[PDB]
Design an enzyme around this catalytic site. Structure first.
Site, PDB file in Angstrom:
ATOM      1  N   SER A   1       2.412   6.889   0.420  1.00  9.78           N
ATOM      2  CA  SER A   1       1.464   6.085   1.178  1.00  9.78           C
ATOM      3  C   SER A   1       0.098   6.266   0.537  1.00  9.78           C
ATOM      4  O   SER A   1      -0.407   7.389   0.464  1.00  9.78           O
ATOM      5  CB  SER A   1       1.433   6.498   2.650  1.00  9.78           C
ATOM      6  OG  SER A   1       0.618   5.629   3.411  1.00  9.78           O
ATOM      7  N   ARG A   2      -0.489   5.173   0.059  1.00 13.04           N
ATOM      8  CA  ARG A   2      -1.791   5.265  -0.586  1.00 13.04           C
ATOM      9  C   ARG A   2      -2.931   5.420   0.409  1.00 13.04           C
ATOM     10  O   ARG A   2      -4.038   5.778   0.002  1.00 13.04           O
ATOM     11  CB  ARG A   2      -2.033   4.041  -1.469  1.00 13.04           C
ATOM     12  CG  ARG A   2      -1.064   3.930  -2.628  1.00 13.04           C
ATOM     13  CD  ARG A   2      -1.226   2.613  -3.356  1.00 13.04           C
ATOM     14  NE  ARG A   2      -2.511   2.537  -4.036  1.00 13.04           N
ATOM     15  CZ  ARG A   2      -2.718   2.939  -5.284  1.00 13.04           C
ATOM     16  NH1 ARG A   2      -1.720   3.446  -5.992  1.00 13.04           N
ATOM     17  NH2 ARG A   2      -3.922   2.835  -5.824  1.00 13.04           N
ATOM     18  N   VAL A   3      -2.690   5.157   1.691  1.00 18.18           N
ATOM     19  CA  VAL A   3      -3.689   5.449   2.711  1.00 18.18           C
ATOM     20  C   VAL A   3      -3.724   6.942   3.003  1.00 18.18           C
ATOM     21  O   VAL A   3      -4.796   7.555   3.058  1.00 18.18           O
ATOM     22  CB  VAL A   3      -3.408   4.621   3.977  1.00 18.18           C
ATOM     23  CG1 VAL A   3      -4.387   4.979   5.075  1.00 18.18           C
ATOM     24  CG2 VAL A   3      -3.481   3.140   3.654  1.00 18.18           C
ATOM     25  N   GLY A   4      -2.555   7.548   3.187  1.00 17.16           N
ATOM     26  CA  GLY A   4      -2.476   8.995   3.240  1.00 17.16           C
ATOM     27  C   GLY A   4      -2.984   9.558   4.552  1.00 17.16           C
ATOM     28  O   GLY A   4      -2.797   8.976   5.625  1.00 17.16           O
TER      29      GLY A   4
ATOM     30  N   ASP B   1       0.802  -1.218   0.000  1.00 24.11           N
ATOM     31  CA  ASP B   1       0.000   0.000   0.000  1.00 24.11           C
ATOM     32  C   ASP B   1       0.836   1.270   0.000  1.00 24.11           C
ATOM     33  O   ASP B   1       0.272   2.364  -0.009  1.00 24.11           O
ATOM     34  CB  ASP B   1      -0.927   0.025   1.219  1.00 24.11           C
ATOM     35  CG  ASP B   1      -1.870  -1.150   1.260  1.00 24.11           C
ATOM     36  OD1 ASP B   1      -2.563  -1.395   0.252  1.00 24.11           O
ATOM     37  OD2 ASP B   1      -1.925  -1.830   2.302  1.00 24.11           O
TER      38      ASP B   1
END
Ligand SMILES: Nc1ncnc2c1ncn2[C@@H]1O[C@H](COP(=O)(O)OP(=O)(O)OP(=O)(O)O)[C@@H](O)[C@H]1O
Ligand SMILES: [Mg+2]
Lengths: 241, 50, 121, 41, 221, 57, 50, 118, 121, 100
Positions: free
Chosen positions: E75-78, E50
């Site tokens: 970070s794709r969650v962010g 991710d």
């Protein structure tokens, strides 16, 4: 193997070079603005001293050494204006081409070129060709002051009045329109007396203290220096462009 | 010049007073830091004893 | 063990500064190759001179290499090494040529080879 | 070393080029002039 | 082998509340060769995860430690994985660092730059010095919030670049000793309200007038 | 003579007054930076001997 | 994780997978060990949610 | 009133309106009032130009390498260098007047005339 | 299929003019960033303004945004888009503030958004 | 050890085309007479450092006295090691040339 390694090395090298050259181009743009400012700042004094020299020559004895051409012209002192830094294009090469054209014009008329240089690039170009450089000036190509121009013009006029030169030329890059950086050769000495016209008819008489000839001979080397300074500023702006 | 001289001596004495007020907090936080370090001492000892 | 807890604060700091200077020199080598030492900052030129002197002072005349150069070898204590490289990093030898740092021992050999070249530490 | 210096005593090692550039056109060499207003052409 | 690693890394999950709400966070490590992230196993694991923290040897040798390439790290969650205080003090950080990286070529030409561009250059230098951290010395989130506040609020524009680390260290020490209320209620409320920010600015100004730079000068604006 | 001495003394008084005015802030900053460098002398000797006792214990 | 660079730029959430990728001797184990050490206060809180 | 334009080799030193311009040419002191015959002169080495306006106080400019030109337009002063009164430090202006170099001593004497001394 | 034989002549000309203006703005963006908009030329500044307007008018109020805002999404016909961007390339909206172009539909929405900030056609 | 010959050095006129920086002999001075071992002591390291300096100073405007002296001596040493084909030199004449 080891070919991809050298390829990636050359890639990062070229990337560094690209960053540096882009930064240098933007810096050169800002400094072109600065140099144009200095040029248009020095313009007014030039205009006013030209007008005063005209008013003085209107009623003077036009037999000054800087004003009469000499029979038996044996030597012309040429001042080549080049740069100190080298990341310019054909700037110095165009100056050197124009100076060689001038030298081969001066050898056609029997005159011997005496060479003064401004800038380290001209120093290199002429020392490689085993030339004889009478005097060199360095360090003020990207921001020349009037004191440098005064020194250069004083040395040149001393050589002219005297181991002596019969003419005086300047090879420098004229800056025009922000699009024309053109290497040009000018003759600064002896000047030529040109008569335009009476222009205004009967007008008021100008008073001269003490008289017109004294002021004329005091202004002539000042005018030489003003023209040398304008040439230096134009060459600086041209080098930045 | 009278006013400037009296203002100079006033600012000088206030500067010395402020120097004192500042070195006060200096030595106070210094003893506090020393205390924190001595406090870490016993726990770093017990962490090895255990 | 190149760690402040093992080798000490000064050892570690001098090593880190040497490494940083050498890394900056490696980054500048391409520009110097193509554009020249002239298009660098004054700070960058200072760093490049320091880095050349550092990378030459890291070399050493080794005891097992006398059969290749004819010159005997040298042993340098670690405190002398740390102090010499701290001086090089601060810039105390920016006037000594690049040579006289090459295949020497400590600071006494540095002085001797500098004066054999016409220099003074 | 003596022999080398005595030999260098008698050893013999081995102007501007033309550039073959054609003359500037005199019409393009500018001349600084003094613009007088008196009638005397 | 892609199946070998994806089968393993898809078991790290955040469970639903019906399943208990537990979670397993995976931090897989991949060693690359010559910074070749296009190799087979690096490509696979970059595809699976991710987000990525890329660590460079050059950044390590320049003194940037941890040697994270913030430009390419992702970070794709962010911001869904941050508290509000960190989400607020670090929102102006990425653009600032990208501007600094773009302007790094004009370091020795500050006088030839716009005033805004020289400001961005100095701010970026301070922010690069702010993201450095010793080994085995993690910081609680309230202290990271205070540090990134020091950075992005402007309270480091007056401190020398070579003193930012020491300034942040000593200021966090002071706040741990003297003003524990700011950190305590940042930790409890997960945000930095306006009164907490005001008290923080006051403490920063007092500390600045107390702090002593390495060049002898004053860090007071 | 007295009036010329008076005008000279007035000029000198203005000059010295402005000079002492500047010296006010000058020596104030000088004293407070001496104070803060003395303060920074502390909090490190404390850190120094704290590190020494932590390691010897 | 306790690292300002990660927590500010590349935040990791509970249930997420954050690859740590680098050449060698770049600090990957250090990052992960610092992340592990940063949970000491969470463990001390005694709260199974933290 | 008359229009004064003092220009230097690379900058316009001053420009404005005045009621009396006093200076000293190589033949003696001179003072120009609003209407005045056209004139061209050369100022002395250590020249000081004092300009007088209606409400303000006298400007006092040390000029180095000047040429005076009075016309119908007004007064125009060419200079190589110029320094206003409230920009000169009398210490360097005094220890330069004692120099052995002619033009730098003249510059020092001009600055001294401008500050008020000599 | 951005080809004169598929979409038509006017569609192609308008799209190519928009692309030319945006590419020139992209070229000038770095000069603006490092030096400043004050350094640019007059036609340069004019093109910068027009290109910022075209950039912002390429935006739209999407139907995926009705969940948050509450206002429906736009469906601008091809003819209206061609005409609007032709006018924007001419310069018929260089007096309108920039914010009047953010997240709108065709030309009617542009007018009603402009007059909300105090600007007419 | 290896004697690495390069076509770039061959074309430049350096013949034999030995790349002095990457060529080496692992036996070293034990494979020489004492005269040659004493005159050609650090000749390979000297030429390697000279090639390094010549590459680094390719576009240097000005160079101090030590760097320019190194460049002159290195150029002379490079020209001294060139040799035609099938034209050998006895070891004493080689000693004399390296002493030069
Ligand atoms: N943030 C840091 N600050 C200073 N030094 C660090 C930091 N992180 C790591 N180091 C140092 O870098 C060295 C190597 O780091 P580390 O061993 O964690 O890298 P690694 O990714 O595990 O590489 P490898 O697996 O090849 O050993 C260690 O000796 C450590 O002291
Ligand atoms: Mg590891």
């Amino acid at each position: 193997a080891a070919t991809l390694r050298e390829l990636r090395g050359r890639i990062r090298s070229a990337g560094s070079i690209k960053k540096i050259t882009k930064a240098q181009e933007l810096i050169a743009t800002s400094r072109i603005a600065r140099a144009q400012a200095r040029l248009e700042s020095a313009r007014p004094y030039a205009f006013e001293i030209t007008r005063m020299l005209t008013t003085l020559a209107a009623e003077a004895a036009l037999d000054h050494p800087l004003l009469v051409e000499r029979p038996e012209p044996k030597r012309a002192g040429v001042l080549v204006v080049s740069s100190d830094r080298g990341l310019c294009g054909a700037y110095n090469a165009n100056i050197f081409r124009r100076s060689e054209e001038l030298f081969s014009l001066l050898r056609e008329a029997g005159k011997q070129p005496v060479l003064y240089v401004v800038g380290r690039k001209a120093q290199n170009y002429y020392s490689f060709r085993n030339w004889n450089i009478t005097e060199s000036w360095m360090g003020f190509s990207e921001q020349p002051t009037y004191e440098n121009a005064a020194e250069i013009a004083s040395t040149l006029v001393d050589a002219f009045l005297l181991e002596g030169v019969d003419e005086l030329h300047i090879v420098y890059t004229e800056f025009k329109s922000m699009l024309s950086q053109s290497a040009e050769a000018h003759r600064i000495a002896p000047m030529v007396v040109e008569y335009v016209e009476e222009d205004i008819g009967p007008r008021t008489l100008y008073s001269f203290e003490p008289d017109a000839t004294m002021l004329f001979e005091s202004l002539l080397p000042r005018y030489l220096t003003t023209r040398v300074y304008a040439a230096l500023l134009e060459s600086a702006a041209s080098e930045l462009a | 010049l009278a006013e400037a001289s009296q203002a100079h001596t006033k600012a000088l004495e206030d500067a010395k007073s402020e120097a004192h007020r500042v070195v006060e907090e200096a030595r106070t936080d210094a003893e506090r830091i020393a205390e924190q370090l001595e406090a870490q001492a016993d726990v770093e000892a017990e962490r090895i004893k255990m | 063990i190149l760690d402040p807890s093992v080798v000490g604060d000064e050892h570690y700091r001098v090593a880190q500064e040497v490494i940083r200077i050498l890394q900056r020199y490696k980054d500048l080598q391409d520009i110097i190759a193509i554009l020249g030492i002239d298009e660098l900052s004054e700070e960058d030129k200072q760093l490049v001179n320091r880095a050349r002197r550092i990378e030459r002072f890291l070399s050493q005349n080794m005891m097992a290499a006398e059969q290749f150069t004819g010159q005997p070898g040298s042993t340098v204590p670690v405190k002398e090494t740390i102090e010499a490289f701290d001086r090089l990093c601060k810039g105390d030898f920016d006037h000594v040529p690049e040579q006289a740092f090459f295949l020497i021992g400590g600071l006494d050999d540095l002085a001797k080879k500098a004066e054999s070249l016409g220099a003074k530490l | 070393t003596e022999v080398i210096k005595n030999f260098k005593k008698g050893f013999a090692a081995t102007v501007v080029p033309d550039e073959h550039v054609e003359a500037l056109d005199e019409d393009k060499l500018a001349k600084e002039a003094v613009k007088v207003k008196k009638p005397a052409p | 082998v892609f199946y070998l690693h994806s089968r393993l890394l898809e078991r790290c999950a955040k469970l639903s509340d019906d399943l208990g709400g537990g979670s397993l966070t995976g931090l897989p490590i991949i060693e690359t060769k010559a910074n070749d992230i296009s190799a087979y196993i690096p490509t696979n694991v970059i595809s699976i995860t991710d987000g990525q923290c890329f660590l460079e040897t050059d950044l390590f040798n320049q003194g940037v430690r941890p040697a994270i390439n913030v430009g390419v790290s992702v970070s794709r969650v962010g911001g869904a994985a941050q508290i509000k205080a960190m989400k607020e003090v670090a929102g102006s950080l990425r653009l600032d660092l990208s501007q600094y990286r773009e302007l790094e070529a004009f370091a020795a030409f500050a006088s030839d730059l716009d005033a805004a561009s020289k400001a961005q250059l100095e701010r970026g230098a301070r922010l690069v010095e702010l993201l450095k951290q010793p080994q085995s010395q993690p910081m609680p989130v309230e202290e990271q919030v205070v540090s990134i506040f020091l950075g992005t609020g402007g309270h480091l524009d007056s401190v020398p670049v070579e003193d930012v680390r020491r300034f942040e260290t000593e200021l966090l020490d002071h706040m741990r000793a003297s003003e524990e209320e700011i950190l305590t209620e940042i930790r409890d409320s997960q945000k930095l309200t306006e009164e907490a920010a005001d008290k923080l600015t006051e403490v920063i100004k007092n500390f600045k007038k107390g702090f002593a730079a390495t060049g002898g000068g004053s860090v007071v604006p | 003579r007295e009036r010329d001495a008076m005008v000279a003394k007035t000029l000198a008084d203005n000059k010295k007054s402005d000079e002492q005015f500047a010296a006010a802030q000058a020596d104030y900053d000088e004293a407070m930076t001496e104070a803060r460098v003395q303060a920074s002398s502390l909090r490190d000797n404390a850190r120094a001997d704290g590190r020494k006792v932590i390691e010897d214990a | 994780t306790g690292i300002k660079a990660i927590d500010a730029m590349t935040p990791i959430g509970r249930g997420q997978r954050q690859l740590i990728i680098g050449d060698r001797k770049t600090g990957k184990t250090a990052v992960c060990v610092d992340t592990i050490l940063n949970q000491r206060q969470n463990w001390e809180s005694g709260d199974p949610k933290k | 009133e008359l229009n004064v334009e003092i220009v230097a080799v690379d900058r316009n030193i001053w420009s404005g309106t005045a009621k009396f311009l006093f200076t000293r040419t190589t033949v003696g002191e001179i003072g120009i009032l609003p209407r005045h015959i056209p004139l061209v002169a050369q100022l002395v080495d250590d020249a000081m130009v004092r300009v007088e306006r209606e409400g303000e106080k006298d400007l006092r400019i040390a000029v180095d390498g000047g040429f005076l030109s009075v016309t119908e337009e007004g007064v125009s002063i060419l200079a190589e260098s110029a320094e206003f009164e409230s920009e000169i430090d009398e210490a360097a202006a005094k220890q330069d007047s004692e120099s052995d170099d002619p033009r730098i001593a003249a510059r020092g004497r001009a600055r001294l005339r401008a500050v008020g001394a000599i």
